[PDB]
Amino acid sequence: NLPWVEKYRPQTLNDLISHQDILSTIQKFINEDRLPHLLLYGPPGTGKTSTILACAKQLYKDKEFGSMVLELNASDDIDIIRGPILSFASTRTIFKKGFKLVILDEADAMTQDAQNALRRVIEKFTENTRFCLICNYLSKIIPALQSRCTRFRFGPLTPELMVPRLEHVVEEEKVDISEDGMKALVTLSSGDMRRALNILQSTNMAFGKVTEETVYTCTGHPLKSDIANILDWMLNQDFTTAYRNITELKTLKGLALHDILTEIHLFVHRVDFPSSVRIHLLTKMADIEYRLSVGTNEKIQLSSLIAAFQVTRDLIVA
Amino acid sequence: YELPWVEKYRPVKLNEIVGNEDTVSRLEVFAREGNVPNIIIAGPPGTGKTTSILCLARALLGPALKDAMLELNASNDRGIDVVRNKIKMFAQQKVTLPKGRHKIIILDEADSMTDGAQQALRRTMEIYSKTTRFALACNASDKIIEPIQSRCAVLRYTKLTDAQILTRLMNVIEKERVPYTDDGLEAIIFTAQGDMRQALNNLQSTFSGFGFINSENVFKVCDEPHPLLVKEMIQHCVNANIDEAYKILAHLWHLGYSPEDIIGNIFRVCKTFQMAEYLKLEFIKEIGYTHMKIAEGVNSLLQMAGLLARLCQKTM
Amino acid sequence: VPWVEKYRPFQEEVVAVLKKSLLPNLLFYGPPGTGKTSTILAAARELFGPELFRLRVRGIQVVREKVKNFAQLTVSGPPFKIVILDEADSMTSAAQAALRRTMEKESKTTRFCLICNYVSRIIEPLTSRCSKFRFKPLSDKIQQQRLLDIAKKENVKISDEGIAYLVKVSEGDLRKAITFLQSATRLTGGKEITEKVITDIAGVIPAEKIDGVFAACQSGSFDKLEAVVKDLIDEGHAATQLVNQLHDVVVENNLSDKQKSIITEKLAEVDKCLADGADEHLQLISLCATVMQQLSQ
Amino acid sequence: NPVLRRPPILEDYVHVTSTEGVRAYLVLRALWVDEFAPRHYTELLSDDFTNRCLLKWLKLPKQKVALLCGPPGLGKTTLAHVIARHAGYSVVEMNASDDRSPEVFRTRIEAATQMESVLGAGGKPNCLVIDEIDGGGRRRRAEGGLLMRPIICICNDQFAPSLRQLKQQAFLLHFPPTLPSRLVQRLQEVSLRQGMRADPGVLAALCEKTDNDIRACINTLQRRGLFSVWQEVFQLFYRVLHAAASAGEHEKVVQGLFDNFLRLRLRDSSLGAVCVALDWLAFDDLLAGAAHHSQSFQLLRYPPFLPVAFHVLFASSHTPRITFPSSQQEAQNRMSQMRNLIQTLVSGIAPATRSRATPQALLLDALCLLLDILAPKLRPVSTQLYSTREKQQLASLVGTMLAYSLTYRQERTPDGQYIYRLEPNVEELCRFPELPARKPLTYQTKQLIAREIEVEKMRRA
Amino acid sequence: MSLWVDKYRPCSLGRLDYHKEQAAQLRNLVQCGDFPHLLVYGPSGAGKKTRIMCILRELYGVGVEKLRIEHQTITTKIEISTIASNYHLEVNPSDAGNSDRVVIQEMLKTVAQSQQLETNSQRDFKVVLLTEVDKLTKDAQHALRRTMEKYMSTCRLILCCNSTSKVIPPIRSRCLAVRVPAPSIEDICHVLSTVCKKEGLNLPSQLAHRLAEKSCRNLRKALLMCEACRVQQYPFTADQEIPETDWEVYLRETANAIVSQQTPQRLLEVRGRLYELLTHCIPPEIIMKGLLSELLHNCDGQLKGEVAQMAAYYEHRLQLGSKAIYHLEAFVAKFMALYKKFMED
Numbered sequence A: 001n002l003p004w005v006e007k008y009r010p011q012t013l014n015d016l017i018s019h020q021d022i023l024s025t026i027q028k029f030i031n032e033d034r035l036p037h038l039l040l041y042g043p044p045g046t047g048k049t050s051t052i053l054a055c056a057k058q059l060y061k062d063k064e065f066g067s068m069v070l071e072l073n074a075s076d077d078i079d080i081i082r083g084p085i086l087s088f089a090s091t092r093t094i095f096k097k098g099f100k101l102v103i104l105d106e107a108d109a110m111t112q113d114a115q116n117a118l119r120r121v122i123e124k125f126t127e128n129t130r131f132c133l134i135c136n137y138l139s140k141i142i143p144a145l146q147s148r149c150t151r152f153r154f155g156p157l158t159p160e161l162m163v164p165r166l167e168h169v170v171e172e173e174k175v176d177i178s179e180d181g182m183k184a185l186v187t188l189s190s191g192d193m194r195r196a197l198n199i200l201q202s203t204n205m206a207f208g209k210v211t212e213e214t215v216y217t218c219t220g221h222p223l224k225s226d227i228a229n230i231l232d233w234m235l236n237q238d239f240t241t242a243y244r245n246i247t248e249l250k251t252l253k254g255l256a257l258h259d260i261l262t263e264i265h266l267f268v269h270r271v272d273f274p275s276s277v278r279i280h281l282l283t284k285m286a287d288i289e290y291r292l293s294v295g296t297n298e299k300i301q302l303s304s305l306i307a308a309f310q311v312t313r314d315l316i317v318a
Numbered sequence B: 001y002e003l004p005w006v007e008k009y010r011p012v013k014l015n016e017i018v019g020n021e022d023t024v025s026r027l028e029v030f031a032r033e034g035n036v037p038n039i040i041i042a043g044p045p046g047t048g049k050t051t052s053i054l055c056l057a058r059a060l061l062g063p064a065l066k067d068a069m070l071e072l073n074a075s076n077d078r079g080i081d082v083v084r085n086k087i088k089m090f091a092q093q094k095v096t097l098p099k100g101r102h103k104i105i106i107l108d109e110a111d112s113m114t115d116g117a118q119q120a121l122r123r124t125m126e127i128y129s130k131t132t133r134f135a136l137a138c139n140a141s142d143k144i145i146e147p148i149q150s151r152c153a154v155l156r157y158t159k160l161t162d163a164q165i166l167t168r169l170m171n172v173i174e175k176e177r178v179p180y181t182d183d184g185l186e187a188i189i190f191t192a193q194g195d196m197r198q199a200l201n202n203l204q205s206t207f208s209g210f211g212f213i214n215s216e217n218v219f220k221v222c223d224e225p226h227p228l229l230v231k232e233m234i235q236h237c238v239n240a241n242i243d244e245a246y247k248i249l250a251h252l253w254h255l256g257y258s259p260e261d262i263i264g265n266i267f268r269v270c271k272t273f274q275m276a277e278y279l280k281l282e283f284i285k286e287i288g289y290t291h292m293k294i295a296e297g298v299n300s301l302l303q304m305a306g307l308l309a310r311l312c313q314k315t316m
Numbered sequence C: 001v002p003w004v005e006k007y008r009p010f011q012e013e014v015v016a017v018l019k020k021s022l023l024p025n026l027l028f029y030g031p032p033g034t035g036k037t038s039t040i041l042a043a044a045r046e047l048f049g050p051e052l053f054r055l056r057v058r059g060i061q062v063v064r065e066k067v068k069n070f071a072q073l074t075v076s077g078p079p080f081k082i083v084i085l086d087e088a089d090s091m092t093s094a095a096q097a098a099l100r101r102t103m104e105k106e107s108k109t110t111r112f113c114l115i116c117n118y119v120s121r122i123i124e125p126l127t128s129r130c131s132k133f134r135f136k137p138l139s140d141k142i143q144q145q146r147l148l149d150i151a152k153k154e155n156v157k158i159s160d161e162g163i164a165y166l167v168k169v170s171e172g173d174l175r176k177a178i179t180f181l182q183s184a185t186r187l188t189g190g191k192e193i194t195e196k197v198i199t200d201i202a203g204v205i206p207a208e209k210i211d212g213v214f215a216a217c218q219s220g221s222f223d224k225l226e227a228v229v230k231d232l233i234d235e236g237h238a239a240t241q242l243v244n245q246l247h248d249v250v251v252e253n254n255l256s257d258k259q260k261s262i263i264t265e266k267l268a269e270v271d272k273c274l275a276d277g278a279d280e281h282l283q284l285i286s287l288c289a290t291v292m293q294q295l296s297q
Numbered sequence D: 001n002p003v004l005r006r007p008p009i010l011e012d013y014v015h016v017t018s019t020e021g022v023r024a025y026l027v028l029r030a031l032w033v034d035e036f037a038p039r040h041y042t043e044l045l046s047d048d049f050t051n052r053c054l055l056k057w058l059k060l061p062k063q064k065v066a067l068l069c070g071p072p073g074l075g076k077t078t079l080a081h082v083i084a085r086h087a088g089y090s091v092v093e094m095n096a097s098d099d100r101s102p103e104v105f106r107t108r109i110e111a112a113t114q115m116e117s118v119l120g121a122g123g124k125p126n127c128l129v130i131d132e133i134d135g136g137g138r139r140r141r142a143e144g145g146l147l148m149r150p151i152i153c154i155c156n157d158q159f160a161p162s163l164r165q166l167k168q169q170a171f172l173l174h175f176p177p178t179l180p181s182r183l184v185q186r187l188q189e190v191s192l193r194q195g196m197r198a199d200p201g202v203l204a205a206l207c208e209k210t211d212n213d214i215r216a217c218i219n220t221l222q223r224r225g226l227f228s229v230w231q232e233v234f235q236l237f238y239r240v241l242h243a244a245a246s247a248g249e250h251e252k253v254v255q256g257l258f259d260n261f262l263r264l265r266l267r268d269s270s271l272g273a274v275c276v277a278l279d280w281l282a283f284d285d286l287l288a289g290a291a292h293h294s295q296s297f298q299l300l301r302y303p304p305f306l307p308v309a310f311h312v313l314f315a316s317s318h319t320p321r322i323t324f325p326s327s328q329q330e331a332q333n334r335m336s337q338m339r340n341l342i343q344t345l346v347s348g349i350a351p352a353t354r355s356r357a358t359p360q361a362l363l364l365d366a367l368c369l370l371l372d373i374l375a376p377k378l379r380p381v382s383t384q385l386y387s388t389r390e391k392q393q394l395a396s397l398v399g400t401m402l403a404y405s406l407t408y409r410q411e412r413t414p415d416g417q418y419i420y421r422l423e424p425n426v427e428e429l430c431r432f433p434e435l436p437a438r439k440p441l442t443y444q445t446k447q448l449i450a451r452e453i454e455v456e457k458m459r460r461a
Numbered sequence E: 001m002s003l004w005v006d007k008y009r010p011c012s013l014g015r016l017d018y019h020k021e022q023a024a025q026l027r028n029l030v031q032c033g034d035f036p037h038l039l040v041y042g043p044s045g046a047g048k049k050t051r052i053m054c055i056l057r058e059l060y061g062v063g064v065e066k067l068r069i070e071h072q073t074i075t076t077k078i079e080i081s082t083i084a085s086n087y088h089l090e091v092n093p094s095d096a097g098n099s100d101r102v103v104i105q106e107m108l109k110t111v112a113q114s115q116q117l118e119t120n121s122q123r124d125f126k127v128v129l130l131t132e133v134d135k136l137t138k139d140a141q142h143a144l145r146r147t148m149e150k151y152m153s154t155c156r157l158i159l160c161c162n163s164t165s166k167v168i169p170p171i172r173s174r175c176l177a178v179r180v181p182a183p184s185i186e187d188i189c190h191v192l193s194t195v196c197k198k199e200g201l202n203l204p205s206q207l208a209h210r211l212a213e214k215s216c217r218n219l220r221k222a223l224l225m226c227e228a229c230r231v232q233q234y235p236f237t238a239d240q241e242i243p244e245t246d247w248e249v250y251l252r253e254t255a256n257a258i259v260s261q262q263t264p265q266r267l268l269e270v271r272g273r274l275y276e277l278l279t280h281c282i283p284p285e286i287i288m289k290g291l292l293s294e295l296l297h298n299c300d301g302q303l304k305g306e307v308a309q310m311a312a313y314y315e316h317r318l319q320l321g322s323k324a325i326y327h328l329e330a331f332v333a334k335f336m337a338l339y340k341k342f343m344e345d
């Protein structure tokens, strides 16, 4: 049927979660008419677009919503700034009164000159037009452009404030889910609600049941047991057998060296290494992760990771 | 409704600009003498280039400013034809002015037009210089072609000192009677980064959000990796305490900050951190390399951890 | 006509769940010979029937606009059309981001079934927004029998150990051994395909050269390393191939753990440098110097 | 220490063992110019070789187009205007102020060239000037082969690839700097019109303050501050002053630092310091590359550190004589000149059905080509048997140089002595200084080789 | 037909002097149908161009030798010069700068359209020859492989490059690699003797060995040097003063100057020498390799490894950067520091 990401998209201010302070502030601005230009930024899929749509629909009824809110996306592209945006901002309303509204999804994709043009347009008509700029990276925004609007950071969704939302979907979409399955669904989501919903739907389609092993296989993410085994092999087994075991596991389960390397990073900081050993390991793992980006041979990088660990064994034992 | 403080308290005369004092005095001298040559303004954003140019044009032309001044922005079309058609015809346009006055063409964000547009603008600047003057403004001086700078008086602007920012902010506070505290002023100055526009906008937003201005509210509305925590980060890096530095970094990452923000704030703290100059240069170079890695796509937490490790090993 | 397209084909199960959707975006990866395109074509034919045909897709703006022109069109009514975009990993990062945006605002009418070589394709549609599926490569034994059959029907004079060598040099995937065999029989004229012909075709460095390199490293005289590296470069062998083969040799020798670790780390650095286009001769000289320093103690 | 000999009693752990198997455990956890513009030939200034030699060519020895070269400030813009005024000819000038379409080029130039004047017969001849040359190139070269009235295009380099195609039909002048010998006096009679008094010493200082720029000296009757930051960094917190006062241009500061730090003589075993400085320079290069490869303006906050990096490293008392950087610019323009010479050489050789070798390979291996044409200096005289079998000799050399289009031609230095230099002039492209200089071929031998080349050209029907 | 390099270049595959097994394999490949795209690679001066010319000679008639100058333009407009014949076109697209992808696409379009104009007397396709493919950009190589897939039936591609490191795997995965190793010392001796004998001369074996070892197994270098030493003095002796190119000598003198004195003034002099080297458009990698090679002749055995590793690291940094002198200067300074430390200890 309809994918659950929009099939259960929030529709009112009450449906949103974990941002109650931000929603309260925007509601106060709306009620007191002091609504300034809005700069919303954060990790992907935390409900920024849904939040601003909910606020706009609260302020504007659907009869006039189309004629008083110009929703646009930056990746659809400078002519956007000088064209539809300028035309919309350069006239007052059609039916209602008050300020209009422009929502610019994925604002970080605009070029610097385009951002300067947008800044000039915004300053020209700040009285009767308000701009909501939505982006993932704040650093992509020209400092002059971000000096015209209030910045709101939408942090990632903490589990206990996003678990109940998933439970409603489970009650609605009849899929059996275990406790460890739910925990793994939260962990792989990493505060991303869209990711959580997509993983849930893909797991349900693949097997009809949600469990830690099921979701880990569906997403291809390595299991914690596998990472522990790899760490134990590097710390204990000799180089040849450690390489054989790691290569066999990786080719059997289709693991990716990036996820592997991230998980051993987490374990390295979890375990109690000596300070110098930890520094050496961090420097190395950073170097390997850099090497993967340019597109090197993965086998050599994996063996280099093993090498980085294999050196410490004599150092740690002493 | 009320105007934004960045406009409600925009200076209207060159006498009330807290920017580079020598350049401001030079602009006042140009306004008095009248026959100002073509001027180019470059520097950090929001230091008052646009305000200075507008005040100069208003002082020079006075009541004739309505029809003797032409202004183009990035919001307008500054294409190869526009400079050939609008600029040229405006230059040819007949306007009677006092002896020391000339038609002023203002091109803010002058760095934004292409190479061809500026090449065409060259001759029009050269020909009609007897009656038309140009007031360019840009953030990066390298973007405008060398002949244009050769036939103009390039006027550099700099990031305003914290004293000037404090004076302007305190003036605005007296205007608005906003309650404050020294910690809030230090925080707003730090968030300003030498930018009057940024400082005023942040102060107005902070006052709107919470009224009384203190460091807590300032960092609440102007959310960023807190400079203090970054200070303990760098201090731990100096003392080679990699574990504590990682603890702070992991706390910041779990707070959800993007790695780009964290690294930028780390470098900003490394500006004023009291620590050995050679070691500070080493740290700056390493942070620059890590920021290279971050900006080109490799933005994992592992990269920041490697940064911390290498900073720890720089002190050995 | 190439023999790869002639005979290109386990995972018929995924077709059933696609037909069960009566729809997350599909992502198919794995070794290229796993028949992913054939699988998705068969699934589309089964789901939509013979009377419903569909687009298949090098630029990014043109691709995305064509996606709008198709998905914007209505359908007779089945409800959702699934877009292919094979060779997804070949797309640049900006192109992949634009394609990700194009995936939105069209999910209400059309869906996407991307085909790529896994992790090489960028993150934000790879994580969420797509239902991933891995296509396992055929087992080495089955590939050996398949290549034996191909040699028999195409009367190629190659021995069984030659087939094993051929499937070895085509590590982990099919249709590379097939095209290697076709090129080999066309170069040899079909008279005989020896193992050295396969070695030359695949670019593999002969093991004797690796043995000579190791002997020079063990000698302890830098002049011998200079001479052997000069000779190896003069032979035209790519430095990446030398790095790979010497890596495979080193990782399974009887060298000490410290020596193996240092040599493999140096190999990784050299491979990274070669990825950026550094000079082959200098990188090989440095790697052999490190190997000397480890082996001379 | 975190290492444990034996596994912990009540907390999680991971075990690590050495190569031998000793084993250990670790816890896991969780205006004026027009007024005083020259009127006739009497208003020209001294020490100028352009106005004194353009008139001879522009009289009615048969060149078609002109060119501008040399440094500015020589009055090249008013050169043609004054020449036409002296000769009575008309003047036409253009620029890029109008849209420069090729059809527009035809409209602007065909009328100016091929049409007479609606006036008396005296003013009918016209002079044409093109400004800001940098589609138009093919248009200017199209009519340049069959026009009558010469046209001047404003430029500074004679080695531009587009300009040399027109340069071969140009009667170029020499462009010496215009000395201030008569500048001071010329300003002196100008002061009579102004009515303001300036001392002759003050006038000379003003001439030197503007590098003898007449355009600025006239307006004086009404430089670059990059040396300041160099003085701040090279000689004596302290560093915070630099970051708060180095706000100028950037790349030229980098070039000055790169060109000046070696001249400074703080200490001779400072190889560590120069290594660190070079590391910083490479870091700046990488920053410049990456900030453009990835459009991240946030990445360029660091390069301001490079002047600070040279400080502390090279800070000392007053000592060095800081000079303006030109080594990088000299290297860049000389690179461009050598590359243009490469294209000029290869354009007539490799496409010519022969020379199956890449230009880079030819470049690295062009020295032996000169050695292969050493030739015997016995001065052969007889029309037969030129000192050796001609087939294995000079005839083969002539065929070789004809394949490569190499020729020897007459040259005359300003000293007035006959010189023979190979026309492609690849010795500068191949040979290097500071090495044992091989003796070149004699003047008579180059006469000889040139005449066999001339006869072989007509022999190959 | 004057220079020994071109005069004695063989015309057909059958008359080659070395790698005759590869010549036979190429003859078998061209003899059988379904000619694929080729990726010829090897060190410079090994005969890649000669081998490709002989492949064309076997593939088409002798008329392939009748090359013609061709000039073509592309949209953006950029005009480039090309070399073609009545069955094939040869172009180095890398000379067109970063606009190489569009010129590759346009040239392939034109060749594909033109081949259908009854250019089928012997073969049903034209040959598009690309030199120095390694200098192409990644997007250019992607466009190249895409167009190669596009017009496989109507035209064929032959690629020549000194190395395959910079070639994208997608191109290598769909082209037939033809490795052409540099000929051995003995092969260079025979071909030098064969040229010497066919010219009516006499080359002593010791002189041939000196030429071969000095030429660094680059046959073009060997032939140029042999002709130069012949015109210098026909009666060859074992002690013949064989000349060499000026830039090699200048690089050797630069390395000698580096060794002689480790002082910053000497460092600036070496920088001037490096400016002189780069001016003549010799690639930075060549300068680095030659400098390292001559430096090792003076360094102690225990020091050579550090120097080699430093040279590789700084060359890689130079590849990453844009200003060549910065990294070359850094390598020179680092070498001077290390050599000063070791000589003075």
Ligand SMILES: Nc1ncnc2c1ncn2[C@@H]1O[C@H](COP(=O)(O)OP(=O)(O)OP(=O)(O)O)[C@@H](O)[C@H]1O
Residues within 6 Å of the ligand: A004, A005, A006, A008, A009, A010, A015, A016, A017, A018, A043, A044, A045, A046, A047, A048, A049, A050, A051, A106, A134, A165, A193, A194, A197
């Ligand atoms: N706070 C939330 N509460 C409930 N569902 C949420 C929340 N945030 C996101 N979602 C779910 O994730 C989907 C995607 O959210 P949305 O695109 O609006 O987020 P965003 O943070 O603005 O991200 P992006 O910039 O990627 O569009 C929603 O349609 C909804 O199903």
Ligand SMILES: Nc1ncnc2c1ncn2[C@@H]1O[C@H](COP(=O)(O)OP(=O)(O)OP(=O)(O)O)[C@@H](O)[C@H]1O
Residues within 6 Å of the ligand: A144, B005, B006, B007, B009, B010, B011, B016, B017, B018, B019, B044, B045, B046, B047, B048, B049, B050, B051, B052, B108, B109, B137, B138, B139, B168, B196, B197, B200
């Ligand atoms: N020196 C100053 N004193 C007081 N206020 C200032 C000063 N400089 C800037 N401001 C404030 O900042 C606002 C923005 O300044 P302005 O538009 O002139 O910026 P700018 O430096 O030209 O930058 P940009 O071109 O990036 O917009 C002014 O309207 C004013 O409120």
Ligand SMILES: Nc1ncnc2c1ncn2[C@@H]1O[C@H](COP(=O)(O)OP(=O)(O)OP(=O)(O)O)[C@@H](O)[C@H]1O
Residues within 6 Å of the ligand: D033, D036, D037, D038, D043, D044, D045, D046, D048, D051, D072, D073, D074, D075, D076, D077, D078, D079, D178, D214, D215, D218
């Ligand atoms: N020989 C001369 N006699 C008199 N005045 C001269 C002479 N040469 C130059 N000038 C004066 O010097 C100034 C230079 O004017 P002009 O525009 O011709 O210079 P240019 O050298 O062609 O220009 P540019 O320096 O911009 O390349 C003018 O004021 C001109 O009158």
Ligand SMILES: Nc1ncnc2c1ncn2[C@@H]1O[C@H](COP(=O)(O)OP(=O)(O)O)[C@@H](O)[C@H]1O
Residues within 6 Å of the ligand: D356, D357, D358, E004, E005, E006, E008, E009, E010, E015, E016, E017, E018, E042, E043, E044, E045, E046, E047, E048, E049, E050, E051, E180, E191, E219, E220
């Ligand atoms: N078999 C051969 N017999 C004689 N001369 C040869 C032979 N092979 C190559 N050469 C000579 O060596 C030179 C190598 O030139 P080229 O083909 O450009 O080398 P590469 O293409 O490998 O850089 C050719 O000019 C040719 O004259």
Ligand SMILES: [Mg+2]
Residues within 6 Å of the ligand: A045, A046, A047, A048, A049, A050
């Ligand atoms: Mg959203």
Ligand SMILES: [Mg+2]
Residues within 6 Å of the ligand: B046, B048, B049, B050, B051
């Ligand atoms: Mg401004």
